[PDB]
């Protein structure tokens, strides 16, 4: 998904 989280996701 292009609208999914594009940043670091630690959890």
């Amino acid at each position, epitope marked *: 998904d*292009p*609208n*999914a*989280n*594009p*940043n*670091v996701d630690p959890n």
Partner: antibody
Amino acid sequence: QVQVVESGGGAVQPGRSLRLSCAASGFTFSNRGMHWVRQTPGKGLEWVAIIWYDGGNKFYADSVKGRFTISRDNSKNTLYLQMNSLRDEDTAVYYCVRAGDWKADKYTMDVWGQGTTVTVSS
Amino acid sequence: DIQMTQSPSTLSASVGDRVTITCRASQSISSWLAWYQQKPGKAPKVLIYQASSLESGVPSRFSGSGSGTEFTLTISSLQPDDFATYYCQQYNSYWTFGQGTKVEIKR
């Protein structure tokens, strides 16, 4: 301050290429997705491309597919936009925009740079 | 592709007036609507995300409402610094913007 600064815009002949850069400061650039967005008075704000924090996932608007390429150098805190086969309708102010990190199912953009102007012209 | 439509395109108001800007989506975007403020020659700044969440540092006179296909940006008491163009944006499928609403100030 969270800050992004575009560079590289200028006059470019139709059919030629130009590379834009975006210098990031005031935040951890390596941990954020990044966008390119462009603006014109008529067609308004048009999203161009996005790149994941690690430089892997990339998505492009159909208007620039096959001609524009987004990339990034996390060690230099820089975002790039390689623009090939430029046309008259590519003239715009080009903004580099940081992805917002608000916890949710969907994601967008928060902080914009001052912009750099690309003028396709002979 | 989802098209966003704003109304009105331009509005004139006095300091202290309540300003209401509307934004309509061509299909349901749930609450995935952001509002931005742009001054001439300047970059847009985010005001509201998730239709109603106020970003840090944004004055409380800016309020966002709506869901599905109809959304509203409300300025409770217009200030001189609120002279700007305001853009809505859906982030349900990629990112598309409305055409913008210019707010001019009578004095």
